[PDB]
Design a protein around this ligand. Sequence first.
Ligand SMILES: OC[C@H]1O[C@@](CO)(O[C@H]2O[C@H](CO)[C@@H](O)[C@H](O)[C@H]2O)[C@@H](O)[C@@H]1O
Ligand SMILES: [Cu+]
Lengths: 67, 67
Amino acid sequence: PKHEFSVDMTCGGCAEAVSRVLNKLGGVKYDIDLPNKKVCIESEHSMDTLLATLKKTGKTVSYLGLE
Amino acid sequence: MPKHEFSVDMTCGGCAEAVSRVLNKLGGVKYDIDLPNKKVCIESEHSMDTLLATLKKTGKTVSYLGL
Ligand SMILES: OC[C@H]1O[C@@](CO)(O[C@H]2O[C@H](CO)[C@@H](O)[C@H](O)[C@H]2O)[C@@H](O)[C@@H]1O
Ligand SMILES: [Cu+]
């Protein structure tokens, strides 16, 4: 499944930060849309693991669903 | 009591808010964030190690500017 999250990013540095923590987690295929403040992820990790990883950044995060 | 200074690569207000949230979550800290100068000052008993690790959770590039 491809999980979609709303992540409050407001500059390229914000997106870069999200990319860095997801890479640290590893085993992820993702794309970040800055203007629409959305991050889509595909991985063997649980939704909870992904959510916690994103929330640890200090940014506002919410789960939108999956495709 | 110790007063630490860190360099944090923040590039927008949202970046600063995220740093604030991770420090608020850690607790036991008195901090000041200087966005334009990419500097975060922290007065805390928490070890330099703990503070560095906490700031790194933001996914931003962090370095130590000393006591
Ligand atoms: O610290 C490595 C970590 O940084 C990220 C954050 O987006 O990527 C940036 O740094 C890379 C250098 O290794 C650049 O190639 C890349 O373009 C840049 O965004 C993570 O992707 C990477 O794991
Ligand atoms: Cu930002």
